[PDB]
A and B are shown apart, each in its own frame.
Chain A
């Protein structure tokens, strides 16, 4: 027994390529499309709920997840790898930040922590890189709204809007045409729905689409009253119904 794989499984090839990272990126390319758009007063991230069978309950599988009350994430690639990354991300937000400063981490720093976790699966002994790309959206007092992308290599970059996965090339092009620095959240939601429609083959509705936003504080989602400074989470997942109402004005 005992893990005796203490050497790297990702190494440099004569051409300078890191094979395992390139291959992980290829797995990301085969994944269902997901995207994110940053507005002036919010951020939207969305993807398609590619149910693997009509007998499956697509709601019991969340592709969009809350990391902190003001930060959410979505991905493209290997769903199981994403799931554990979310568990680790939620935990590191506490162990490396909340239990020290008594407040949730700003978006860039949490992204930085996730990125570190992914980089390590690129050099540590006995493991393969995570086969996913993430789109993390959030808000924090001193930086406002932000959107980031994290790749299998651990690299991450901020975006105004972007797409990853299957038809990311076409979707990125469609976003470059409609994006401007004056967009309001509802506008971005609208643009998000339009972009996603080109990537979807079959049914396109609130039950096959998963979408969340980072907007204003939702005092009704807090759970208690009595403390003025505590106004609620900015992260909110739209309901199947909220999505349909917007599809009619498509």
Chain B
């Protein structure tokens, strides 16, 4: 019935000291049945990161759509799209389907390659932007994520510390949601490098 609760899944992003983190679970189910434990929900175009929760088919279609648009953008502009710009592109792309919306909860993370400023943003299924400086959450366990993040979060955390924070927020939220979990991946992002880590978690 609710397109947003058929497949399950969560995404969360946090800003730190000259860095950003975006993480997601790996589950893909069909109601109570777990189907795949390798369904990643984070993608990247150049140095800009996008996480998407909701109906799996739309998660996939949106990734293909944004790969398509950022590719043309690069060819015409002769530079990679920035976080702020891409956020506007997501928003306008979603509002374009105002009355036949994609059932998703997009999340953007990245660092402006020119100002070095960390950036994150969230959206509802029709494009409304939520530009918080601390964290953005999305998915079937969003209430839980808000709870963890509000409690665990603190400003200017170092990459190594932010990693522990984002991970604990993801993990414990996922464990109180039946449709979330089954593996997780975390992305730590810095102006120069990006590290991807798979977390060990409950498999039930």
A residues engaging B (CB < 8 A)? 99-103, 106, 109, 112, 141-142
Contacts of A101 in B (CB 8 A): 85, 88-89, 92
**B85: contacting residue among A99, A103, A109, A112, CB under 8 A:** A103
Residue of A101, A141, A142 ringed by the most chain B CB atoms within 10 A:
A101
How many of chain B's residues have a CB under 8 angstroms from any CB in A?
9
> What separation, in Å, do the CA atoms of A112 and B77 have in the docked complex?
11
Contacts across chains A and B counted by CB atoms under 8 Å: 22
> What separation, in Å, do the CA atoms of A101 and B92 have in the docked complex?
8
Task: Give 10 A-B pairs besides A101-B92, A102-B85, A142-B79 with Cβ atoms closer than 8 angstroms.
Answer: A100-B89, A101-B85, A101-B88, A101-B89, A102-B88, A102-B91, A102-B92, A103-B85, A112-B76, A141-B114
**B92: contacting residue among A100, A141, A142, CB under 8 A:** A100
B residues engaging A (CB < 8 A)? 76-77, 79, 85, 88-89, 91-92, 114
Contacts of B76 in A (CB 8 A): 109, 112
> What separation, in Å, do the CA atoms of A102 and B85 have in the docked complex?
7
Contacts of B92 in A (CB 8 A): 99-102
In chain A, what residue has the closest Cβ to B85? A101
> What separation, in Å, do the CA atoms of A100 and B76 have in the docked complex?
15
Contacts of B89 in A (CB 8 A): 100-101
In chain A, what residue has the closest Cβ to B115? A141
Contacts of A100 in B (CB 8 A): 88-89, 92
Q: Would you call B77 and A109 a contact (CB within 8 A)?
A: yes
Q: Would you call A142 and B88 a contact (CB within 8 A)?
A: no
